[PDB]
Amino acid sequence: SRGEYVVAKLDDLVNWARRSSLWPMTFGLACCAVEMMHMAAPRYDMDRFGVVFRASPRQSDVMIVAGTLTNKMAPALRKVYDQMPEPRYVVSMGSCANGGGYYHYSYSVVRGCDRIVPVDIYVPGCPPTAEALLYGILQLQRKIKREKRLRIWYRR
Amino acid sequence: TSVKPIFSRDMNEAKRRVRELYRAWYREVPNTVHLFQLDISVKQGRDKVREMFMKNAHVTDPRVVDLLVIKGKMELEETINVWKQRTHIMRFFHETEAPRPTDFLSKFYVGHDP
Amino acid sequence: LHHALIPHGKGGRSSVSGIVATVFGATGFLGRYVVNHLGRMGSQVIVPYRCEPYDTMHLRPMGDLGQIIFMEWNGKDKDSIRKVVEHSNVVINLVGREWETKNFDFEDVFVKIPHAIAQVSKEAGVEKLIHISHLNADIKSPSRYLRSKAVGEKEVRAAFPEATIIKPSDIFGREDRFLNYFASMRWFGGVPLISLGKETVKQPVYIVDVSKGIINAIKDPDAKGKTFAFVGPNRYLLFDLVQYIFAVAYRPFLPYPLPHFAYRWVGRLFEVSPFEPWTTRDKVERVHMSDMTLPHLPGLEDLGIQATPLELKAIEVLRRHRTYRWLTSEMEDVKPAKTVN
Amino acid sequence: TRPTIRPRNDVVHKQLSAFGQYVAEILPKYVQQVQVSCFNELEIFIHPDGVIPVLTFLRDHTNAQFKSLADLTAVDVPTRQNRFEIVYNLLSLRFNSRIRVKTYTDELTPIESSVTVYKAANWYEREIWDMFGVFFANHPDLRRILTDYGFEGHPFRKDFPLSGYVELRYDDEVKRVVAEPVELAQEFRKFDLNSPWEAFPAYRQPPE
Amino acid sequence: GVRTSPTGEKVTHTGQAYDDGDYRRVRFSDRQKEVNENFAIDLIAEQPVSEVGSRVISCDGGGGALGHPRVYINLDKETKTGTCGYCGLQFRQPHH
Amino acid sequence: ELVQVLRRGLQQVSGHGGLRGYLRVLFRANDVRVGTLVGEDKYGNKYYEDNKQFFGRHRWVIYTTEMNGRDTFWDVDGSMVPPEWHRWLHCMTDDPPTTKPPTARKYIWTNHKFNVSGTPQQYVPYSTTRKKIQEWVPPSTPYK
Amino acid sequence: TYKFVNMREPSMDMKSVTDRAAQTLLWTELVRGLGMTLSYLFREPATINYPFEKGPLSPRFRGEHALRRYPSGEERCIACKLCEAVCPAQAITIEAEPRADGSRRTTRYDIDMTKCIYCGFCQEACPVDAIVEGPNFEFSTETHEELLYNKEKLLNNGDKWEAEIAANIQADYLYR
Amino acid sequence: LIAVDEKLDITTLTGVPEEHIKTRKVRIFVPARNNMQSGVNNTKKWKMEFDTRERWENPLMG
Ligand SMILES: CCCCCCCCCCCCCCCCC[C@@H](O)O[C@H](CO[C@H](O)CCCCCCCCCCCCCCC)COP(=O)(O)OCC[N+](C)(C)C
């Protein structure tokens, strides 16, 4: 159908822009944040792919939870995630963000940031290498490429 | 056996400190409700303060009472300075905990708990 | 009971409750609340979805590892319905649109889909079926919404004789329509009301109470094939209810009477939207209609839930509509609305 | 040569023993015991109320210029009447030496705050209070430093469970993070590793 | 040597297979079940039997330091083969 | 001299097999360098080496346009390389699999599978242990 | 010994004073910094073209876990639980029973990859070199469940990466 | 130095929940020697452990 083709082209265009322009929030908690610095470093430059750190959550699309999430920190993480405007994606990085990691059986550690925020991509490691994090970011981009919001809406 | 007192010597001064802390907490509930934008009433907050005070009413040791009022002052100064968030203030209410059954028959039905 | 369905734990996030529930239309208001309660219990939840998976992200933290399963579903495909209800002993039906789309009508979303779900679930061996309908479900009702609701209720009862049919009055909550629809008429100057809202009586019910009642129906063994009416503890006139809503929102309330034909034309105007309509003629009729009284049917008090009054949870919903001048105003600053009891 | 054994410093051992006798003679009112470990670490056990005089002497004395407070911690030994053990590590830059002062206390006994002698004692005593429940009397600002706001109980006590009693999660019904009783998908597995054969005869205790 | 349960679900080398009435098979709907096709027991049975003319033989698994700890198998019981249990390898004295 | 640089650019244009191949490698690989072909795997990936580049850029892979059953003209993953060429590309050795083929075993996968997350072939966890407790089965015959 | 990082005083002769005044009025050090950045602009960038180019690694790199086999196809693991005992994060769960032929073999061998810290203690404690940490590191998933590996997943990883794992072990087994 | 004619009770200060204060019975004992070994070095110190509670099987991964 002409309308189906038009909406397919439109939501391919929309997904391309969001895929190609990712603005992670400047948010690092622990040693896993050093590998984010090494990804931003010249060797594995994230700026090539359209990935640019922004301080404000209002101007951010992706939240990279890289570090141990504690009970004292969880409200702040939830607050900044809520203040991020939609569409918003979450990449948990390292063992601490994925599950508990080395501190899973601890009184002051949340066993996974997925108990607080909906996580889209999980990157395993302690810490994940810069290449591993870049692979996770590209996998998130490929996940965005498959979203069909206008195609869902047209048949809604 | 004589022991080093923290404060209050005998129990009368401990009760005086308890009353001072209770007044300080009582005069703070409206401000806490207004600042934190809590959906509870002021009466509910005052009743919760009363309940939290009452669960330690069986203490008969002046040093334990002194430590209790010290920790109460700490958690009050955390509330006044807005160091706590709405999360903790509502944690005082256990709004999400399911009602635990307390009768023998219900405890027998649910599981192996004593 | 199968050896894997025996309850274990203390009713926590990581416990086992022995409930395998397929929740249709979980990507919604009542759906999300029910899924949250099930995950809090620690049950296995299957979530059939037809929308974008991104719209189901809010359901991810509601359950432990593997306790929530997302599967695609059509509604017109009995194969997909069977695929999603194959292994679940409880099926909850909350599918419904307040308006009509090009592909789905009130006939499809309230009669065909619930009937197909009930028929396929019976073949699959589902032990319990919960079906959500409307309190004012009358076959001779002026609203096609309510007519289809009644027809689908009859079809579901015929297909699954051991069903539990729940009839909420009007659910209000953070993401509801009722309070939000009433409080969103600020932009359109005044508040148009039919007969100034003096001839309409409503008793809205709280979303948490509705979800808890739905959960308790599953657990209660003596509510297999019954009918329940979920209503609030107090009945209000429409004028008084809207006035209280605007007072809590601290907005200037300017009611004015609008004739029924003019209101119907206005509702017809707003339903030309390709997107979600702001209002429809059926919505206007439902707002004008008084809530029915069904003393014979059981309710939240019979299921063990004390109905939460509006005055306690109105500020949770209407604080968002306030301005910075009144954002910090307390709950007690507004006098309770006038009841009709 | 014995390449696999650490060499010993008898000169430093003798110097530390002499200085221990010196301080014990100078402060007989509070010093209860003096020990020197075989790896040359002096240790002084004093009365709990002698903290201020002993630390002031060790800081201001000409022959003991311990101007730096290296560390301040507590050790929990539940089998003792005075379970908590307060440990001060002092560093003397003038003489290039280190000393340790150990005192004892229980839950209900305050310990005089040494913030008037060393400034780092402020945060060190705040951490000690937060983690063990030991109260310091004259502390300018005593409150929790590491634990969450409203956290109940002192985590570093031996009787505190490893995973605590509560856990946090986001509850969508109330639209906020909530605290609920702890519940683990996989329970922590306790390992019994102690060999039933005595390893070091030198530390064998009398059968009693 | 993968085997299929009556419910259509493949059986792993440990014999794992969810029952017909088990609800946990829903996790495999619209997805797959991770089953390893190579069966170690079948392969080690397919391995032949080595014959050595000595009462005691030694097995280190092959590769030297890349194998398993060296063990000695006593080939005196003529009614059975002596099996190195680290690698499940059978040895036997030449009969007849 | 700028002339030599321009001639090198023209050689790179003609080294990929005309303008069409140059554009294809420019748009799907973002780099138009030319290097010697070390080898090619069974999935269509090509491997090139250029020792004049600095360490890190001296080896690269041009992925195939279709692996297994997925069209990977644009969706190229770093997990699409078979393990031997993976070792060579990540520089754990200086010997390509063509020169030093890996030891052959009967249990090694013949077809390499990329990361299958987000697809129906994704890994789903389950318990591999049998039921610990067997429950009593009541008799099927009546009594009394 | 020691040295002073900043204890030099400037000379007060007329030429030096005039030079300092010129530096203040004419931004000499600022121009110097600009020149440094311009030189770096004209240098060659140090960015590799991922994923077509990969960063250097070593045979000792620890990534995804795998369970190996003997050349005959029999599993190397003998269910000795040394890896479970030595795992710092308690990420390994092992349950074993005699096999149909009486071999000491595992029935459950689970590794939680969201709990593992990738420290490599399991491949040091293995006396038969069964469990290894393979060279693969690009195994990010979209759900938490997919990172809870079981015995079938680990055996599949071993069969998938056996060639590279064997090559790395051959390269680096003389240092252990 | 005050004198208190009371028994020590720091239950309100330990922060333990009332359920785990009231419904718990510890067992004070000297551990039995493991019969598989002849060593007796693990039978010299008294131990305190709590009563066993319910342990169930996780639906995922068992
Ligand atoms: C700015 C002011 C407003 C402008 C309004 C819009 C103006 C027109 C916008 C033009 C968009 C150009 C898009 C060009 C396509 C991207 C290039 C190509 O690579 O895309 C591929 C294909 O993209 C998608 O398949 C579809 C792209 C968009 C399809 C066109 C939609 C219709 C465009 C024209 C409509 C404009 C009028 C209507 C709106 C105003 C996917 O590449 P990708 O895999 O990711 O690359 C990964 C990197 N690798 C290669 C190294 C691995």
Ligand SMILES: CCCCCCCC/C=C/CCCCCCCC(=O)OC[C@H](COP(=O)(O)OCCN)OC(=O)CCCCCCC/C=C/CCCCCCCC
């Ligand atoms: C049109 C394009 C122009 C391009 C020029 C760009 C130059 C390169 C830019 C790099 C620098 C840009 C970022 C740096 C900004 C800050 C630089 C700065 O602060 O300079 C001001 C500098 C800093 O002062 P202090 O170090 O704090 O010393 C004060 C002691 N109490 O001081 C100045 O004000 C110098 C300003 C320069 C003015 C020009 C010099 C005047 C000399 C006059 C001689 C001619 C006399 C005319 C009469 C002629 C009679 C025949």
Ligand SMILES: CCCCCCCCCCCCCCCCCC(=O)OC[C@H](COP(=O)(O)OCCN)OC(=O)CCCCCCCCCCCCCCCCC
């Ligand atoms: C030559 C003649 C002209 C040819 C081109 C004609 C069209 C050009 C574009 C016109 C503007 C957009 C028109 C409407 C697009 C579809 C919007 C829509 O209905 O989206 C539906 C849906 C909303 O959600 P829904 O599925 O309804 O569910 C409700 C809650 N989930 O999903 C969404 O809303 C998805 C979120 C994004 C929606 C907005 C973006 C749509 C595409 C815009 C492309 C152009 C953008 C230009 C931006 C300004 C310039 C920089």
Ligand SMILES: NC(=O)C1=CN([C@@H]2O[C@H](COP(=O)(O)OP(=O)(O)OC[C@H]3O[C@@H](n4cnc5c(N)ncnc54)[C@H](OP(=O)(O)O)[C@@H]3O)[C@@H](O)[C@H]2O)C=CC1
């Ligand atoms: N809300 C109220 O005031 C009251 C409602 N009820 C009834 O209770 C039920 C739940 O109400 P509520 O949560 O407010 O409704 P919502 O509109 O918020 O949610 C409807 C749900 O059903 C799904 N759905 C709708 N149409 C279709 C379709 N054609 N095919 C498949 N799925 C579909 C939606 O998914 P998706 O987004 O993917 O389309 C969504 O998950 C409804 O039947 C309603 O009539 C009863 C009393 C009061």
Ligand code: SF4
């Ligand atoms: S996963 Fe490892 S590297 Fe990352 S924050 Fe935790 S301890 Fe640090």
Ligand code: SF4
């Ligand atoms: S690498 Fe370390 S943390 Fe990971 S499974 Fe092995 S021993 Fe455990």
Ligand code: SF4
């Ligand atoms: S250390 Fe090796 S042989 Fe022992 S249980 Fe672990 S993997 Fe198996």
Ligand SMILES: [Zn+2]
């Ligand atoms: Zn062997």
